């Protein structure tokens, strides 16, 4: 049954027919909804072949040439390759199309209005961790573009049956070290304690600051990962200050410009790309609310509240809310002043509503994960709160994969 | 490991498995292919007897007498009653147990820590619209208790073979009118436009303010509903003021004290109580964020922001967020000053986390609808954001039911 999807602010209704194209089960059943789970529980040539055919069909339909010579000859090449070898290879233009489609299909992404504007670097000719690093540096330099951020992805060689994966061990290309104490507390970013510890153990000389940028651990197939320090000139950061509260800069807070996620698997036509780091730009709430105010991240709410002289002794003063707002304001202000691309959660959700509408017209639906699309402050103040959404898995897709250690 | 959903808290790192969901006998709207958890309203002799036997089994476990001789004699009496009459009837203590359990089972209610403290008024002897009114007045008086609110439900007679239902037409016992204007806008609460116009069709003389309390339309079996005006002294209201912004009082905003929901069906052991109004107290975001700030509700955000002198011409000022926070603060401050029970969103979510722990031990789980439990401002600042939840239907249950017209 095709779901009816209602917007409760406007009264409008659509029907999602794209979901019938899903060949891939999520975590829910009629007995119970597991839509709030962050990760999946779990984490043959005929099956590869049908995923391949389907993807090649998606590709040819996208260039309008769907039935042509070229199309039927490509299907046969894929077929011949699979049958003889158990696997196949994409053409670069197919890869480019598949990478954009993976982004488009990602239900947790509120930035998808931008899905067609993606620079794709083909790095499938990579044979060593040293070469990975070179490609990574060019990606960063390109994507960063002195603050005028440009969306990008770099695709390293696919998984192959007989061998280890290319992997980037770090979860993003820029991460701040998290240093555990003998007394259990963390200095820096508690989300990165484990990667920090792996880095030291592979020979990194640690720092002891709150915002020490980590080296990368890059792994070529079946080899120990190697360590590469990013040149500081490549890592653009933004000092945080507040437009009217002058002590705020005194807090010594900063964040990096480029969100470049480096641990997700890209799946295109049944092929799997274990190292395919991608980047866009930040939505301010990711920094201002989560990364700075999460209790298990930098957890700065209390410090900010005290500096604002708020009554911290009682939840009902809404001290937490008030301090969060000002931190988000600082991030927006500081990024604007530094001429580094960023989008606020109001503008982002308004763009995503436009996206839903474009996708309704173009494909009869849009898979979206409401819990992830609605921002972590001011939820009901954004239009996406009032929008019903259908979550399902289309391919090409970005997926999670096991940590390689 | 365990063959049951694994549930993680990402703030604390802790894991539980929900075994309770095994007890669900009713499908929700999700399938492996697509998740529909964000939809608001997704769309009998042996059947009754099986629901009835299960509910009686639940009652007998709750008083620890399962397999007892009184347990088996009650089961026989329910078979016999259904046998000869097509239906059966609950003992008083079974109704009290069922009502509390429907509350405990409600996945969308963040206030469930209070589930065992529910006063159950048995109004199953009611035989007229006028008597419903008296019962409802008494409910309102007991529950309001001059500001020190007490949770309560009043249960009118069950649906019965052939005979018409008891219904309260109004969605809550207190509703402000919504008067559709010539210019297409609404004075009052836009949520209540259809109920307002029903009231006037049924002979109410409408006012023209923004906070006109509506009459009730009450319907006894096989009759036209009858209109009843609540005496104003029974309807406690709280004028909104802000603790430091002295002009806020001048806006003339107010809200009523008692959230008393009146259009839900209470289902117990396959019996159906079509009128069973219940009340608790408010969480402050219901008033300050949704009712006052939804665009399709009082929509006051821009007005408040202009009084605060914010820059409303750009999203990135965070004007909506700053206004909403102040409006929520005024709600909390005003209810406090007036001594009317209210709970803020931090204290409510903290208590709900306690609830989850209590239910993990008492029954192996707790059905919860993450999108509804997480408050509409300051989401990730509350501990429930970071908590995975499993949503499923257990009975006894409160259910939506179609409007009586
Ligand atoms: C151009 C600006 C972009 C913005 C503002 C943006 C925004 C976001 C946000 C806010 C999230 C949620 C992140 C979190 O809470 O952890 C997200 C998730 C994601 N976005 Fe984007 N996006 C952008 C570009 C991209 C690009 C370039 C890709 C891939 C090519 C992408 C793929 C994803 C994926 C796969 C997720 C899910 C991540 C996960 O499950 O952990 N987005 N997006
Ligand atoms: C004691 C104080 C209580 C608090 C603070 C409270 C809080 C809430 C809130 C905030 C919601 C969501 C409402 C909305 O967003 O529309 C809710 C939903 C609900 N609560 Fe409560 N609750 C309380 C008591 C009650 C009681 C006494 C009952 C029944 C006996 C109840 C049953 C429900 C149900 C059925 C819903 C779901 C409503 C729907 O689907 O529209 N709760 N609760
Ligand atoms: N601005 C952007 C754009 C794309 C992004 C893609 C992914 C991410 C990060 N999401 C990680 C979510 C997560 C954190 C920790 C554990 C986990 F399973 C999942 C952030 C993004 N931000
Ligand atoms: N504080 C309380 C306690 C119990 C409540 C029980 C129910 C409600 C109202 N929720 C109605 C949600 C709703 C609005 C509009 C359409 C719809 F289907 C559902 C509010 C409550 N607030
Ligand atoms: C448990 C819950 O699903 C989890 O905390 C999710 C909620 N929504 C989110 N939304 C975004 N955008 N990013 C997140 O990490 C999460 N976390
Ligand atoms: C589309 C979405 O499900 C809808 O707006 C929901 C989201 N969460 C909610 N949560 C609560 N508590 N109350 C609501 O009305 C809603 N609305
Ligand atoms: Zn689901």
Swiss-Prot record, chain A:
Function: Produces nitric oxide (NO) which is implicated in vascular smooth muscle relaxation through a cGMP-mediated signal transduction pathway. NO mediates vascular endothelial growth factor (VEGF)-induced angiogenesis in coronary vessels and promotes blood clotting through the activation of platelets.
Disulphide connectivity of cysteines: none
Subcellular location: Cell membrane; Membrane, Caveola; Cytoplasm, Cytoskeleton; Golgi apparatus
Binding residues for L-arginine: 172, 281-282, 286, 291
Subunit and partners: Homodimer. Interacts with NOSIP and NOSTRIN. Interacts with HSP90AB1. Forms a complex with ASL, ASS1 and SLC7A1; the complex regulates cell-autonomous L-arginine synthesis and citrulline recycling while channeling extracellular L-arginine to nitric oxide synthesis pathway.
Family statement drawn from the similarity comment of this UniProt entry: Belongs to the NOS family.
Sites where the protein binds Zn(2+): 28, 33
Region annotation (Interaction with NOSIP) ranges: 32-405
Binding locations of heme b: 109, 400
Binding site for (6R)-L-erythro-5,6,7,8-tetrahydrobiopterin: 36, 371-372, 385
Lineage: Eukaryota, Metazoa, Chordata, Craniata, Vertebrata
Protein name per the record: Nitric oxide synthase 3
